[PDB]
Amino acid sequence: LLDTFQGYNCYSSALGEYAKQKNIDQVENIILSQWSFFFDEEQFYKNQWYTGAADGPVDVVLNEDLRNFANIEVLEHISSESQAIDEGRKVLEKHGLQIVLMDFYYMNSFNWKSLSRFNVTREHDPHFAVLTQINENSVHIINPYYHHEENMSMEDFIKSRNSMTKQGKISFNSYEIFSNGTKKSNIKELLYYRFNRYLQEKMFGKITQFGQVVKKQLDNKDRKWAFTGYNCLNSVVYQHQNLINLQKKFSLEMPPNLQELLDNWALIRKKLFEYYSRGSYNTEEISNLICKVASSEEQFAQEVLKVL
């Protein structure tokens, strides 16, 4: 396990890791001060990632934050098999790193056997990685979200970048952090804007919506939603941990229950994974935990604005 920038999702992890290694200001703090929740009932039924901090794979709200606060643009480069590796060589020669979108079917990000899950289903899911080396027959990629690295055959790497996925066709997509005129933001300004937006957009109500949809799964013999939800909600745990770390680094005023809320989300994740794998009939219990944390998060956001 590498000491990679965690961010709160694969996209923000890759952007932050790049910024960390290349000394690009503001990107890390804008990521670490995100405060967000979404729920898409239509994605729930298609077994797509349907909740957590942000829709993806690209975090468009984070891109808007990066433009608004730092005048930083994350440029999407599409390419072709004829040009992509050569463009990669030019980017590595200049910058040493390239942010790429890859089909994670073709790599082994996370050790499921750590949670006693041995039936590790391969899925055509797009995730972000950082390319660090191009050799003749192989590449080295860092998966900062999962703290993993691997060497991949050039054949496999090319397949991972031209693949049809659940969320659409990858075409050698790469992502360039760019600015023609940067801006500095203070951490309290970033948090103020995020917490006001969280309350204005009633993001806590999307947690209640999620809880209500969980209550309605009592008769659903397909428990895959609970696994997807488990994976989706790591982003929320990471935001809570990131805010705890910001509190410490910047000696911030926080409401006193931030750790309790992190614990509440970790317990919801544990119960979702146990429901998925252990055949319990506790959708009502999990629904009740989610609806409880929704109320707690609304109050927490109000209190952050009072004390920040």
Interface residue list for Na ion (CB under 5 A): 10, 127
Closest approach of Na ion to the CB of residue 17, in Å = 13
Integer Cα distance of 115 and 141 in angstroms: 24
Closest approach of Na ion to the CB of residue 307, in Å = 33
Residue 128, Cβ density class (10 Å: 0-12 exposed, 13-18 middle, ≥19 buried): buried
**C-alpha torsion sign, points 194, 195, 201, 207:** positive
Judged by CB, which is closer to Na ion: 128, or 204?
128
Evaluate whether 200 touches 35 at the Cβ level (below 8 Å).
no
Reading phi first (left if > 0) and then psi (alpha if -120 to 50, else beta), residue 220 is in: beta
Integer Cα distance of 30 and 88 in angstroms: 27
Closest approach of Na ion to the CB of residue 108, in Å = 15
Judged by CB, which is closer to Na ion: 127, or 148?
127
What is the DSSP secondary-structure string of 254-294?
Answer: --TTHHHHHHHHHHHHHHHHHHHHH----HHHHHHHHHHHH
Closest approach of Na ion to the CB of residue 236, in Å = 14
> Radius of gyration of the chain from Cα atoms?
20
Evaluate whether 294 touches 211 at the Cβ level (below 8 Å).
yes
Integer Cα distance of 237 and 267 in angstroms: 10
Determine the length of the chain: 308
Closest approach of Na ion to the CB of residue 86, in Å = 27
Judged by CB, which is closer to Na ion: 10, or 213?
10
Closest approach of Na ion to the CB of residue 237, in Å = 15
Two tokens at 10? 């694969």
Distance spanning both ends of the chain, measured CA to CA: 34
Integer Cα distance of 112 and 298 in angstroms: 33
Closest approach of Na ion to the CB of residue 71, in Å = 26
Judged by CB, which is closer to Na ion: 127, or 194?
127
Two tokens at 293? 């944390």
Judged by CB, which is closer to Na ion: 10, or 99?
10
Integer Cα distance of 2 and 276 in angstroms: 29
- Determine the residue type at 153: S
Judged by CB, which is closer to Na ion: 127, or 271?
127
Closest approach of Na ion to the CB of residue 57, in Å = 5
Judged by CB, which is closer to Na ion: 10, or 286?
10
Judged by CB, which is closer to Na ion: 57, or 211?
57
